[PDB]
């Protein structure tokens, strides 16, 4: 039954300057789990489609790095122990995306990260020519 009456909306102001035009927001998620990456990218694409912007999904290959350690302590050169660090990439591109839309979307996603993931933003914005030229 307890449903609030007056929703407190944050203040918003449309400043005098025009918003910046990002040509392409290309985000790259590095993870360790295919399933976690799939869940995160589904989250992201669903949020983007409900916000009303274009989307596209690619899957770069898996990168692995291994290095050999001595299995024992003192004297054993034949027997080694190995490891491998697997990083998995996922790309997500957004075209024709306004500056403030980028702000809200990046705030949303940056708060909605999981832990074991790294996120690389590449922002592409077009602008007019200078005046001195």
């Amino acid at each position: 039954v307890d449903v609030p009456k007056d929703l407190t909306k944050p203040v918003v102001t449309i400043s005098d300057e025009p918003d910046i035009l990002y040509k392409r927001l290309s985000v790259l998620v590095k993870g360790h789990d295919k399933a976690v990456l799939d869940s995160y990218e589904y989250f992201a694409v669903l949020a983007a489609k409900e916000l009303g912007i274009s989307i596209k999904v690619h899957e770069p290959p898996r990168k692995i790095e291994r290095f050999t350690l001595l299995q024992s302590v003192h004297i054993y050169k034949k027997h080694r122990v190995q490891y491998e660090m697997r990083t998995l990439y996922r790309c997500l591109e957004l075209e024709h995306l306004t500056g403030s839309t980028a702000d809200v979307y990046l705030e949303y996603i940056q708060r909605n990260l999981p832990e074991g993931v790294a996120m690389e933003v590449t922002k592409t914005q077009l602008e007019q020519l200078p005046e001195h030229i």
Binding site: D103, L106, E107, Q110, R111, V121
Partner: protein
Amino acid sequence: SLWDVEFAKQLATVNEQPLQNGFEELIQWTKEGKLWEFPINNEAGFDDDGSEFHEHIFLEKHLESFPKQGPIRHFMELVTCGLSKNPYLSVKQKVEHIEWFRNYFNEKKDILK
């Protein structure tokens, strides 16, 4: 002003209440500023005291007390080139380099060969 601050802290203590939401404790963390500033520009703070690209790179104004042909000129020109190439150090450290070299060859001014 002082008693205004006392009254303000009294009002704040009266306002203080327990939060009941993760969003509320996040609002608190952002209020004290421990939570990062999204978007992550990696430059929220550390502006280098409003320094400028030309102050970093163009050391011609810093290079005045020697002619434009000598070996000290050669060395200090290469120094300025390296300093401009290096983004890690600021104009303060760059002028520190330059003035230390100045002191070096001016206290070794006995040669000028």
